[PDB]
């Protein structure tokens, strides 16, 4: 019957895509050196 | 039903003869039931190289016993 009247779409604008794509790579770029060790 | 009592019999007998006549032998160069190993010398008359075989097949076949 009722499909949970409470729902919302998830929104991430273009900017907050960059920061992560930037943040992830940097942390990797920073932590890849140790993972090779 | 006119010439189909003529064509088939006269034609089918041709194939009967080329075996019986053995004409198919030297036409297709198949060995003859006695002809494999000339003399004794039991070995494969295996043709070898190029620009030869026409002449080389004529060695293996040449002996023929």
């Amino acid at each position: 019957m009722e499909p949970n009247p409470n729902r919302q779409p998830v929104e991430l604008n273009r900017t907050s895509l960059y920061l992560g794509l930037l943040l992830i790579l940097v942390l990797a770029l920073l932590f890849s050196s140790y993972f090779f060790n | 039903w006119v010439i189909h009592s003529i064509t088939i019999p006269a034609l089918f007998i041709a194939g009967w003869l080329f075996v019986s006549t053995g004409l198919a032998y030297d036409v297709f160069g198949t060995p003859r039931p006695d002809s494999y190993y000339a003399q004794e010398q039991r070995s494969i008359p295996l043709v070898t190289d190029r620009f030869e075989a026409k002449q080389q097949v004529e060695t293996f076949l040449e002996q023929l016993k």
């Binding site: 779409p9 998830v10 929104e11 991430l12 604008n13 273009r14 907050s16 895509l17 992560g20 794509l21 992830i24 790579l25 942390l27 990797a28 932590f31 890849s32 993972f35 090779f36 060790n37 | -």
Partner: protein
């Protein structure tokens, strides 16, 4: 030179999975009407 043999997978997953997770959310937002 010698290295941690599996250390390479570390980077790849640490790069892709967080990356991808940002794309998937984003492409959605692009589809919002």
């Amino acid at each position: 030179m010698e290295v941690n043999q599996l250390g390479l997978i570390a980077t790849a997953l640490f790069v892709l999975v967080p990356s991808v997770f940002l794309i998937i959310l984003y492409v959605q937002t692009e589809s919002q009407q």
